[PDB]
Amino acid sequence: PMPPSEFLDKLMGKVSGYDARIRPNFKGPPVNVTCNIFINSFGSIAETTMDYRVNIFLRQQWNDPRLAYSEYPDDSLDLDPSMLDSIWKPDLFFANEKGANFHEVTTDNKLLRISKNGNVLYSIRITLVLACPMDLKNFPMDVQTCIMQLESFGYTMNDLIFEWDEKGAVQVADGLTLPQFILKEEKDLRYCTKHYNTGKFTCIEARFHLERQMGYYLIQMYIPSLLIVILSWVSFWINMDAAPARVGLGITTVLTMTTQSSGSRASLPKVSYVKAIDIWMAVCLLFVFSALLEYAAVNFIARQHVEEMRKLFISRAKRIDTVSRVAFPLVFLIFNIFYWITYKII
Amino acid sequence: PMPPSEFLDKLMGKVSGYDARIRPNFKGPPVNVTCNIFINSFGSIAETTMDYRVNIFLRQQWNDPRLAYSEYPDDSLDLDPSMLDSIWKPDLFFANEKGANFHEVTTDNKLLRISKNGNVLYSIRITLVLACPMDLKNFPMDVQTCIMQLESFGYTMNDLIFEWDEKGAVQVADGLTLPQFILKEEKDLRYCTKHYNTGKFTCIEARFHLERQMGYYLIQMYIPSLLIVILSWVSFWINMDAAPARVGLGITTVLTMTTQSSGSRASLPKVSYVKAIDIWMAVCLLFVFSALLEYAAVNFIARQHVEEMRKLFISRAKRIDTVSRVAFPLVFLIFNIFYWITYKII
Amino acid sequence: PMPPSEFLDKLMGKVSGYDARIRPNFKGPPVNVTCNIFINSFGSIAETTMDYRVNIFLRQQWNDPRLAYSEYPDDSLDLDPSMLDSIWKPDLFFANEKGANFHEVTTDNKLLRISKNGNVLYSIRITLVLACPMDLKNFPMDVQTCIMQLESFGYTMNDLIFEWDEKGAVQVADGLTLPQFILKEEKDLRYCTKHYNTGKFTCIEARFHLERQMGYYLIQMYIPSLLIVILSWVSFWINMDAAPARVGLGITTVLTMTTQSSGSRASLPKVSYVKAIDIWMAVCLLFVFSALLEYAAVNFIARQHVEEMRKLFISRAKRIDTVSRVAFPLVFLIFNIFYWITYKII
Amino acid sequence: PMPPSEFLDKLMGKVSGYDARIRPNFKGPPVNVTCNIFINSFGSIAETTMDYRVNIFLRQQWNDPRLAYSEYPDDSLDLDPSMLDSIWKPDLFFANEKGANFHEVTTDNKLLRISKNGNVLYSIRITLVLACPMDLKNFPMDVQTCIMQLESFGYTMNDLIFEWDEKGAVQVADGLTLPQFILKEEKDLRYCTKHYNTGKFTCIEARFHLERQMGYYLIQMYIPSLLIVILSWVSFWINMDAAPARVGLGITTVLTMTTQSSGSRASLPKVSYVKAIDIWMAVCLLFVFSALLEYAAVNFIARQHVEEMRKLFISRAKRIDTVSRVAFPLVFLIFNIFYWITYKII
Amino acid sequence: PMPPSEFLDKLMGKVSGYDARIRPNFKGPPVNVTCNIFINSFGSIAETTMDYRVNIFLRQQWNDPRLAYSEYPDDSLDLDPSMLDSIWKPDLFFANEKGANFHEVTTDNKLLRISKNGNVLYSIRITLVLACPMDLKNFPMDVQTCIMQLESFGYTMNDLIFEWDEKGAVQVADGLTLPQFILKEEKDLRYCTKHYNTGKFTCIEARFHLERQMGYYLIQMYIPSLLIVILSWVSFWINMDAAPARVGLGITTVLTMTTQSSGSRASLPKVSYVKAIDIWMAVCLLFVFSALLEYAAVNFIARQHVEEMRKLFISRAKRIDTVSRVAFPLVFLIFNIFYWITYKII
Ligand SMILES: *[C@@H]1O[C@H](CO)[C@@H](O[C@@H]2O[C@H](CO)[C@@H](O)[C@H](O)[C@H]2NC(C)=O)[C@H](O)[C@H]1NC(C)=O
Ligand SMILES: *[C@@H]1O[C@H](CO)[C@@H](O[C@@H]2O[C@H](CO)[C@@H](O)[C@H](O)[C@H]2NC(C)=O)[C@H](O)[C@H]1NC(C)=O
Ligand SMILES: *[C@@H]1O[C@H](CO)[C@@H](O[C@@H]2O[C@H](CO)[C@@H](O)[C@H](O)[C@H]2NC(C)=O)[C@H](O)[C@H]1NC(C)=O
Ligand SMILES: *[C@@H]1O[C@H](CO)[C@@H](O[C@@H]2O[C@H](CO)[C@@H](O)[C@H](O)[C@H]2NC(C)=O)[C@H](O)[C@H]1NC(C)=O
Ligand SMILES: *[C@@H]1O[C@H](CO)[C@@H](O[C@@H]2O[C@H](CO)[C@@H](O)[C@H](O)[C@H]2NC(C)=O)[C@H](O)[C@H]1NC(C)=O
Ligand SMILES: CCCCCCCC
């Protein structure tokens, strides 16, 4: 018979009363649009900007009873995407876009198919840079919940309603891994219905739980800060009379821990609250600073000068050294028990 | 009866004398447009560039008596945003744009509805990168007032007048927080009417008060600079004869305070006036530099060499050391009283 | 006779029943499109972003029996690229685009020619920023396999099938070299057929093997880390009584190896697993840290003080020094044998 | 009578012989266009790129005798900017664009009004990133003259002539300040007429004089380099026998002045000639390097060893120390007189 | 008579058989297009990216015998650039674009004029970011040859041929200087004809020779590395018994030369071969490392301890010091002769 685009001339055209500016079931019940996404790419989760770039296939399904047909024999029509300006489409957008674009290389990456009863499937490829507020109270040991939410800009709740479908509403690609995070399989799917002075609008959203990887922040921050604290402990095995040696060891370790602490936050937002790497780098700064304050007590007691009272202060300044060769590895060992268990419960 | 877009053919079309190039009430009183905004996103407040990126819903309300209707029964018409090139719209712009764009993903994020008497509501989503001049006289302790202003480019004051509405002229989203700032609830709403040689044009503006967060700049700048000053004070408890120890402690502390002071301004505009962190990092540099100048007096008096006069200079060089073990923590303590009270009054 | 664009009016126009929205051999066998690419530019292989920018000529060949001709004498028609919106073209895209664009300077860089039997050749110039996941288990000694894959967005497998051609399916330009990598001549060409809930779609892909260049990472990372380890070995030829000399040499070498190790990963993704440069910079950090722990044993044994037992500890602390002048260059020499052979097998 | 856009149908349309492709007074005298600009924003004056971003209102005034009217009563017509593709406009451009764009948010920011005799006023908002070659012979003490020039691309001198108007040809906004510079009120306005092999074209330009702010470069570069030179002078008040103290003070000050000198040019173009901060940082490097060479003479004379000749070399090595405690602050004081007066004359 | 745009209606229109999709002299000899460029801007020659941004006027001259006229009296027609979609233009592009754009501010910066015999002149303004592979075998002493090449995408050699003109085929603006380079006046102009499997296409190219400026890399890299080598030579004038002084001078100079060497390649591509600054920074690292190895021989010989044999080792360890006070400035002086003459021949 007729070819389907020329059959769509009798379906999209001005004959038979079709207008692409009017929603289906007009002056009636609202349009029920059900949605699911397919995540191709995910990542580049920046924390200075507090955003993440995603690449999705946005699928939408509604029903247009004006687009029903019965003369054509087959069940679906793979229409050309240049004829998408002639149908009605919902005005979905993202409440946290922060910039987005289509993909237009070699063809607009768009998809249209219409069933016999008017069921319209519409899939497009979108790249989003979605804004999620980070919560960094325990920074290497945190779980982030970055969301994406899908709203309607022009049609209110009594005209257009978004839903998720009950058969896998968020699909993820096969080889989709992350360098810093892991993506949990459970995904929250709930409503986020927005109220304004204009009206109430539909909104659906999807939460993504991101658990980090411990292994990077151990190698750069935890292990080298653990070596400078041990480097301060060899001052106690050096002679007391070696005054430029034990002081110059105390200076250099207490001023690299300032450098290691400032470099721990170079790729972070400038948040005011204190985090788990900050209370590691402040207590590890306290051990290397109280080791140089130990020798200031050793150097002050030993100068107190009868040689019978002189033997008291030398044996006292050696008594304060034999205690600290055991006590400072012992207090730092029971700090590691209190630190890592607190951030393994959470 | 007729569908409303085809009813808008009898309302927007060339019949009944409607032209989308002519303002309403032409050859009459000026067009009164009232406006309010809704702030979705706010932040990325850069200081090197002195700007901030915002994401608003710009709502505009005017009256077009040509767009009145009485045959259609309902009170409003949710028209399609593709028919916005057929109505008259005001030429609002921003006097401090520095680049801006629309949002066009899956639909142009636009909104149109027309009342029965011709009241037109027009809402669009805009992303702005607005320029605000920073005032950094007291940099961690300042309050910034970054503005946005809304002008008319083509129509003068006798043709088009902007207003704010008297019912919440600036709304803010619910979970809108900032990493570095807090946004005060009181918002100034005043006029900024511009005069040129072309004419006088309407202008309305809105001030936003931004108070910082103290907790970031304490952890990175105030507390580590406070430790290097205390690190200079342990030189006084070291033996006077330890010449490479007390000098090498004075060198290393006075040359990391140069490093800490240059890093205090790495993310700042290159302003010439002196600020509150600069007079902290210069006085804290004065304590660590006058502690090494103290030992240059200790090392010079002790070399002055009868052994009866030799006992005078050693007891004098110990007299200058017992004073400075009390005096230098005392002067720095009464500087912290004068510093933090001065920047708590302001 | 007629000029070929006006002959294409009788070939592309609405006469003779040609529609540019309908695939060839409609209601029949699927469209067989064969493809080959020509790589002009290649490089800027970023590892923080894990992507690479390429510049290709994408050639596509199919058959449209509607575009056959017999009146015109010649075998091909170099048509103008402005008449490409009037023919049918396949909807090829890239599953790992991450942004791409056309080249439109002085003309849309496009090419069309049609044979007598309807064979259509279509070449365009595309710039792609293709995403490839890096595998950095042995980072200076790795081979990366970065792919590119070519899919169909709208037409399923029963409507459109992609192939490679059997005569050089990937060509490379003549003077195409890379600063960091070399491109192997063998290129894998296989299928990547994607299944969704929408349908199954065609996919072809091409693997590119990238072997690095050793010579950069030797000069910056391996050789300067090899000098600091040798710099720690001159402590054993310094007098034992020079306590600020041998300690201050141990401090400075063990705290620059922390700086050299953190700078080894400044241009890398924040991956958690350990790599070959990390186990070089951790063992080279172990030699410079166990050289300062050697002198802490030398300084502790020599202080143990009858002068007959005093001569035992001095000769014992010299015995531990004569061993380490041979043993520490010997263990580091047999570590270089185990390190470089392990990463020459792989 | 008729509304003015429909009156412009009888003025812009194909009736009465109006063509928007033909300049006014065709086959006659050239078109005299007079221009003035209004600078909204100014700044972001980069020196690595040697450019500056400006935001102007470009106003143009010419006369089109085809656009004269006498039936309409008023003196001017605020026409809609969508009807700007129907009039003739001059082809003004900028010879140092380096990228530029229009402003299109909520309306194309354009302005058109036509007088009764045909005088056409045309104002648009443009953002420019204008290229100006920096002259950095005396870098903190320089005055830069960054220009902007306005040419014609298609029409030669015998068809179109640009002028400035004699009533304020460059206006500046009220609160327009700069963080690093000040903008002088005197602005040069002269001709820059370009000759090619195509023809001679009109050109007008406007010079802007930019004087810097001294106060930033004192705080970061001049004052901390002045402290390290004073820090070298305390070596002369330390005992001569303190060999690791006076040498280790000479090493650390001469190797931070290398760091301070390299950081003085991190935000600069890589120019080959020597500038005023380079001859400050090289002479201040000469004082801290000749202070360590002073102790190498003190340490060499004092080792020359009858004890009667031994008392000669110790008193000679103390004679060379008492001179340098006065001479080195004296030579550096008379260098500051010669340095700052030379760069206050210029 | 008729105005020339309306005369161009009888010249460009569908009357008299003109089609803008067909090349001139069709079914005949190929179209000879001659070209010349005018370089407005040049620079921003990045080396990490290995590209350079240029701003040219691209002029093209061909002959269209369909566009000849004899009724109109004058010799040329300055046509409006909006009528450029109605003529035939060659499909010139650049084989190393890496992104490019037009300039569209206030008018498309385009130019068209047609002689009486049909000679068409066509000039446009283009900004290019052209890719040139750097050759950095002798990096501060190199001459770079960065090219640009102009090809045809659709028309082969038998349809369209590019040429340069014999009267100044590349012009350069007057005040066009570079911060890092100088541009030689001799410019190579040759052919680059490309062969594919599609066909053979025309190509012309132009080489630009860029000689650097020595004066920047002396101030930052050569002179400060020359001071650290001299700084190592003052160790020989310090007492042998000053063990923390001569060792601590050897440590600090040998670990800043690692810092100076890594900073010599921070703005470079990661190339594997060795360059002229690398063999400067490796030999200058060899002098500062063999000066600390000198004192390890001084400190080891002097410890060898009858006092008659004790006077032998002290006089031997002073003999090895008097040689090196002459020998090390002598070997470094004859290295500067061999280094700078080798890179003055090339
Ligand atoms: C869209 O979905 C909703 C819920 O399925 C429908 O709203 C209800 O429809 C039933 C029967 O159609 C009515 O009995 C109810 O009064 C409706 N409201 C509620 C709250 O249950 C709606 O009809 C659907 N619209 C379309 C076009 O299918
Ligand atoms: C726009 O608002 C202004 C102020 O409300 C109106 O201007 C006044 O209107 C009243 C009566 O309409 C007059 O008595 C005054 O002379 C006007 N001017 C002033 C300064 O008060 C104006 O009419 C409104 N325009 C429209 C179309 O509603
Ligand atoms: C596209 O290529 C395939 C394989 O060459 C063709 O599919 C086969 O065609 C032959 C004969 O034409 C049939 O016997 C087979 O049943 C087909 N399928 C398979 C799996 O072999 C297909 O015909 C080609 N389509 C076009 C338009 O040429
Ligand atoms: C544009 O301005 C110039 C200078 O004002 C005009 O050129 C002169 O016009 C006068 C009289 O009109 C003549 O006597 C001269 O011969 C012209 N040339 C010079 C060098 O003085 C020109 O006429 C003006 N063009 C228009 C359309 O007004
Ligand atoms: C373009 O230039 C070439 C060379 O000038 C022309 O090709 C030659 O033209 C002459 C006479 O026209 C013939 O004798 C030759 O056979 C041609 N080929 C060669 C290799 O010399 C060509 O005619 C020119 N085309 C146009 C339209 O002018
Ligand atoms: C949440 C405050 C922690 C304070 C820790 C005190 C020891 C550094």
Ligand SMILES: CCCCCCCC
């Ligand atoms: C506003 C000038 C402050 C100067 C402080 C002086 C002590 C550093």
Ligand SMILES: CCCCCCCC
């Ligand atoms: C794969 C783990 C390697 C651990 C090496 C242990 C010595 C540093």
Ligand SMILES: CCCCCCCC
């Ligand atoms: C213009 C050359 C200045 C050279 C100064 C010499 C002393 C550093």
Ligand SMILES: CCCCCCCC
């Ligand atoms: C081209 C190899 C040069 C090697 C120089 C050896 C001395 C550093």
